[PDB]
Amino acid sequence: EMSSILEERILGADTSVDLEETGRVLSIGDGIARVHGLRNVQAEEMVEFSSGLKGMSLNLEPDNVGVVVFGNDKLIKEGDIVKRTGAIVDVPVGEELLGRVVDALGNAIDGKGPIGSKTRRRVGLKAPGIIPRISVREPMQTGIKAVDSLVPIGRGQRELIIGDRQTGKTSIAIDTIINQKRFNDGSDEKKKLYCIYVAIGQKRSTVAQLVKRLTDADAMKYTIVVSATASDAAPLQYLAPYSGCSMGEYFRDNGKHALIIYDDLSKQAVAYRQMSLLLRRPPGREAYPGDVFYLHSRLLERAAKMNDAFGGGSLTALPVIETQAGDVSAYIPTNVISITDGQIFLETELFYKGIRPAINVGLSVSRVGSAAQTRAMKQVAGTMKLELAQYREVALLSRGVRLTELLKQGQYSPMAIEEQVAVIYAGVRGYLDKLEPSKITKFENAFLSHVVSQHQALLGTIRADGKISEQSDAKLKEIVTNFLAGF
Amino acid sequence: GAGSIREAGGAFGKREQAEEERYFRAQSREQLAAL
Amino acid sequence: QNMMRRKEQEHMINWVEKHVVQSTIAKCIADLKLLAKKA
Amino acid sequence: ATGRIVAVIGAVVDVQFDEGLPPILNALEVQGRETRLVLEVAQHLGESTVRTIAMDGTEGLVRGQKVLDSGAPIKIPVGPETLGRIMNVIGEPIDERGPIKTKQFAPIHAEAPEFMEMSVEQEILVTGIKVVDLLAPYAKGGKIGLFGGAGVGKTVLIMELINNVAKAHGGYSVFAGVGERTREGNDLYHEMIESGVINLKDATSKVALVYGQMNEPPGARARVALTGLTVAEYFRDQEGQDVLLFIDNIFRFTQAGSEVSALLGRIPSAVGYQPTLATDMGTMQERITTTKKGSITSVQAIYVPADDLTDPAPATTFAHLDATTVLSRAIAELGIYPAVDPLDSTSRIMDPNIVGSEHYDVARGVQKILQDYKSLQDIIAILGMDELSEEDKLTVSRARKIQRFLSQPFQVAEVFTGHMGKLVPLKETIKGFQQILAGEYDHLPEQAFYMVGPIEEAVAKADKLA
Amino acid sequence: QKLFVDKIREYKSKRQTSGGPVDASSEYQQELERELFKLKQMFGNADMNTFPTFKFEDPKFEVIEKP
Numbered sequence A: 001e002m003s004s005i006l007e008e009r010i011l012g013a014d015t016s017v018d019l020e021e022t023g024r025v026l027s028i029g030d031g032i033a034r035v036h037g038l039r040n041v042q043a044e045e046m047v048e049f050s051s052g053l054k055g056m057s058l059n060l061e062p063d064n065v066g067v068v069v070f071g072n073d074k075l076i077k078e079g080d081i082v083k084r085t086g087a088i089v090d091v092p093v094g095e096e097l098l099g100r101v102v103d104a105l106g107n108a109i110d111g112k113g114p115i116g117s118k119t120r121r122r123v124g125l126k127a128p129g130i131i132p133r134i135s136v137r138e139p140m141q142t143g144i145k146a147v148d149s150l151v152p153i154g155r156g157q158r159e160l161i162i163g164d165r166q167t168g169k170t171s172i173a174i175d176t177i178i179n180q181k182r183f184n185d186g187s188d189e190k191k192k193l194y195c196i197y198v199a200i201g202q203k204r205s206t207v208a209q210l211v212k213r214l215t216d217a218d219a220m221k222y223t224i225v226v227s228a229t230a231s232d233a234a235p236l237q238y239l240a241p242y243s244g245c246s247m248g249e250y251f252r253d254n255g256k257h258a259l260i261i262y263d264d265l266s267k268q269a270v271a272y273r274q275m276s277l278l279l280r281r282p283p284g285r286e287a288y289p290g291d292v293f294y295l296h297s298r299l300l301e302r303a304a305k306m307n308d309a310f311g312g313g314s315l316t317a318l319p320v321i322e323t324q325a326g327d328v329s330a331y332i333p334t335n336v337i338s339i340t341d342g343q344i345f346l347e348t349e350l351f352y353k354g355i356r357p358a359i360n361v362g363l364s365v366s367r368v369g370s371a372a373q374t375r376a377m378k379q380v381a382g383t384m385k386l387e388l389a390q391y392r393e394v395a396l397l398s399r400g401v402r403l404t405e406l407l408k409q410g411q412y413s414p415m416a417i418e419e420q421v422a423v424i425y426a427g428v429r430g431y432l433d434k435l436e437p438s439k440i441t442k443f444e445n446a447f448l449s450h451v452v453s454q455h456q457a458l459l460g461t462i463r464a465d466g467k468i469s470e471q472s473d474a475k476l477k478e479i480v481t482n483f484l485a486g487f
Numbered sequence B: 001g002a003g004s005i006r007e008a009g010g011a012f013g014k015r016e017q018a019e020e021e022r023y024f025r026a027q028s029r030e031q032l033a034a035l
Numbered sequence C: 001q002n003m004m005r006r007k008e009q010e011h012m013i014n015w016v017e018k019h020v021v022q023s024t025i026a027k028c029i030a031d032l033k034l035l036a037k038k039a
Numbered sequence D: 001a002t003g004r005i006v007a008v009i010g011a012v013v014d015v016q017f018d019e020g021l022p023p024i025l026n027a028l029e030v031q032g033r034e035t036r037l038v039l040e041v042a043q044h045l046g047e048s049t050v051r052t053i054a055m056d057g058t059e060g061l062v063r064g065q066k067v068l069d070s071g072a073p074i075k076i077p078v079g080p081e082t083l084g085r086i087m088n089v090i091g092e093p094i095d096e097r098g099p100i101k102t103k104q105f106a107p108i109h110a111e112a113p114e115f116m117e118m119s120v121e122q123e124i125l126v127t128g129i130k131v132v133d134l135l136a137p138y139a140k141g142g143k144i145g146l147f148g149g150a151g152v153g154k155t156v157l158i159m160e161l162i163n164n165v166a167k168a169h170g171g172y173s174v175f176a177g178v179g180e181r182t183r184e185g186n187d188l189y190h191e192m193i194e195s196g197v198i199n200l201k202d203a204t205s206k207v208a209l210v211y212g213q214m215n216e217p218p219g220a221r222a223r224v225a226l227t228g229l230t231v232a233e234y235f236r237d238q239e240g241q242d243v244l245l246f247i248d249n250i251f252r253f254t255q256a257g258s259e260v261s262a263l264l265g266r267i268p269s270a271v272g273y274q275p276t277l278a279t280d281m282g283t284m285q286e287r288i289t290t291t292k293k294g295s296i297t298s299v300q301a302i303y304v305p306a307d308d309l310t311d312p313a314p315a316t317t318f319a320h321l322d323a324t325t326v327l328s329r330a331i332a333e334l335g336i337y338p339a340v341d342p343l344d345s346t347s348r349i350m351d352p353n354i355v356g357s358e359h360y361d362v363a364r365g366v367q368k369i370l371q372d373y374k375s376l377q378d379i380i381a382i383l384g385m386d387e388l389s390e391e392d393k394l395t396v397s398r399a400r401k402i403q404r405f406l407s408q409p410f411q412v413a414e415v416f417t418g419h420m421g422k423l424v425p426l427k428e429t430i431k432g433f434q435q436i437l438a439g440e441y442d443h444l445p446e447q448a449f450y451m452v453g454p455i456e457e458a459v460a461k462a463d464k465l466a
Numbered sequence E: 001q002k003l004f005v006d007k008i009r010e011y012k013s014k015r016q017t018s019g020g021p022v023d024a025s026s027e028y029q030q031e032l033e034r035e036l037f038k039l040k041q042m043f044g045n046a047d048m049n050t051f052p053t054f055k056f057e058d059p060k061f062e063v064i065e066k067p
């Protein structure tokens, strides 16, 4: 149509010209531009090349400025003009990013038009100090039985998902994102969790698959997907986690609660190493720069729970780390493990032995723990944790196998906390030792069906009260006894 | 290298721990009934 | 319908861009005048 | 634009231009050579000097030699005229059949397809290989990667896949030989001529070959994969065809970059590799993809240096693939071929909602029993077989039978094994492994499952032993 | 005001599209047909310009009578 392209597309275009402060490309190569001039450029300031490309000035040196290019250096030649933008790198933030797939700088890559964003936020902001924070109390529900019961996560926590390749880390993150739909459509506003998935160094078709999976479950309406894939410049993959963290800090600072997944931080470390080695900064261990720990700690400190004076919002962080051959002792894995508030260790042996999700409950710890659980979940899960430990000590034994086969879960099926509590109750009270370990799984399905067909009252009770009462204890007791008699 | 079989956490350390726990839980049940 | 609109609009943009390129000292006069207003 | 050579170090050439500095990735022609010596601009050094990577040998270059700028990157002939022909890294024919007379030339450097062009269809691609089809099935339009050390069977497996899929394929096919044996390329050429897939007399050829082999300098070995990509990308975009792209070996690409990375003046990364390993690999691999304009099913053989899967190159390649077939030297020394590691090979369509609950359950049970066997291996090694329980001995016996039954004779391996190859349908594989897991053959010896096709051949071999 | 020249002149040129369907294209069909083929084949296979006629089936049932 000749109206959508000319009514204001040309009528309003900011045709004015300005007196620009510029420099001149001395050299260009491998995404690094050494630029003469640019006297008044700031450190980490965003500059613009004469071909529309943008870069960030990282090495302020006496005779040149080292600029990392946010794109392909094919379009930059020696002698090109580099204009200042006067601003430190920032990205659009707000509610208008929900449902959109954007790149590391906030440009929509989903072919749906521009993000109608009016607020912008720096990517390198400082984390909140001691005073604005308060203890982590509200639970972040993942929908995964093993996590929600034995490695609970609160709102404002940093829980690391660490494991080998193809162990099920992205599956945990996506289950957690899908789970928040029960709360994001409800009426309680302080229970809604807006999700953010940062894809760093991934295949682009993998991100397309993930967005398809999130749209199938209708989870995209409250999810921002930041995508800096394998073909994107190393600066963009370096900057994607900070852009996502700014998009989440917007919610954190407004009384809302957000969840961010960094999938994964090993590839961000690789991209940062590339940028640093090409900026001629001296290498350290495994050629990584000296400040890779600072790279990840200044990022993972921005996940926080705020007190009431600052809105009461939160930002939960689920960084992902891929280890080689199970070497948790590597450089970046140990860095991120020392940073975060706990880890969820996934194993290949546990994966192939049928334990899915392959969470290693022996190693998986949540430094927040029961402080961020519901009372009902705590009641059942303290006993379940004790019995699973005692089973691991001798692997009674039949109850232990029952609980193990009860921790298994399908993919893309995050259960509600009430149904989780009912299942763990049925498993921890003896109602599962009369059945062989093989059939346990199917019973659960049937059980859930029954409970979600004719017993919505007890589930609503558990949901509202948060704890089980002795009355409701007896109710669910008799329900599960009758169902086991009929099963 | 004393205690290195259990310290390696292999298939032999797990069975060692299982043996100790079995034996001493049997002994604890035997010692609690006689108390 | 949406696809037709999208492709027709894209070719319209391409054609307008190609055809304005084919189409004056008044340009330099206004340029010097605006550089005078640079303050 | 004309410049002059000011430095020659290996495959790297510095060229100083008096006017008209050529952009990065442009192709330059050296004047005064007997053959075509193409330099690809990689860096702008400053003071009107560029640094380039040579696509051929740099012997005989003199400082001050003239160099013309072409005005564009390396452009290769693309079209249906490249089918049945062999071209090198710069698109020149190396089959002595004259010029490739296409109507269009495409640059080997292009942008990766955008996010809105990606496809999501995940239909299976049955290969006739029991372990692949059972445990890590391939998908049409997906990315397959065959990992393996030296002499474990990557070329044998990729030739078996060419035999089992490319002949039965309806679309076109492109084979990019990257840093491999030249006699293997000669073998493939003549075998495709014999089998009619390449026709030297008319235009019914279905395969295009692009070879830069291990006798080539590192620039040709680094860009020949891009040349093959360009051919396959033309077939996918402008023809809308379904393309098969076989790349053996893709690791060489990375390795070639390593060989030039020092001469380009870059601080080395881990294990001496270029600091740009992951972004170079990503730029290359993101073009190897299925878009909503056409499909590309890709089979890439990936060399594993010194059998170390944690090496940066295979470790980085792992993230670009939809299916990984990891071959193991330890399994190859047990006589089991193909040497697929059943607990290291994965696939993204190994999903009940995609392959069926029956397939999924059989695969997961096989992997469970193999993991349990591996857990028992230590006690079996020290305390012998007799110190296990009854269920442990049953697990060991069934796991060994399953290990044997995962092996299979290939038709490309008929020449040096005598055993006729087997193409096992997917349903027969699922049935045979379901039956072995059930226990219906706990009475047959384990040697009866070694190097057979369907389970009926296993019982026939059992009845032939006794 | 060459930007306004672009605006006005090319608006009046594109508006001269009565006798032409797609504003003086002379091309863009060879790829549009492949695109429409893909779009139709991924939306369906039947004729998508007429109302769908509905074949319907009835659930089977067995001899449940007490033997």
Ligand SMILES: Nc1ncnc2c1ncn2[C@@H]1O[C@H](COP(=O)(O)OP(=O)(O)OP(=O)(O)O)[C@@H](O)[C@H]1O
Pocket (backbone or CB within 6 Å): A163, A164, A165, A166, A167, A168, A169, A170, A171, A172, A322, A356, A357, A358, A409, A410, A411, D319, D347, D348, D350, D351
């Ligand atoms: N809880 C589960 N139950 C069954 N299958 C699962 C489960 N979790 C993951 N899987 C499957 O195991 C495979 C692991 O893939 P996934 O993306 O979840 O892990 P990953 O660590 O991100 O792998 P990578 O990073 O190498 O791509 C997937 O095919 C997935 O479908």
Ligand SMILES: Nc1ncnc2c1ncn2[C@@H]1O[C@H](COP(=O)(O)OP(=O)(O)O)[C@@H](O)[C@H]1O
Pocket (backbone or CB within 6 Å): D148, D149, D150, D151, D152, D153, D154, D155, D156, D157, D337, D338, D410, D413, D417
């Ligand atoms: N499917 C197979 N059956 C029998 N032998 C095989 C098979 N695959 C490989 N081999 C053996 O391993 C050798 C190496 O084969 P090849 O595929 O060329 O090694 P590479 O992994 O380097 O490509 C073969 O000559 C053959 O002896």
Ligand SMILES: [Mg+2]
Pocket (backbone or CB within 6 Å): A169, A170, A263
């Ligand atoms: Mg993943």
Ligand SMILES: [Mg+2]
Pocket (backbone or CB within 6 Å): D154, D155, D156, D180
């Ligand atoms: Mg080989």
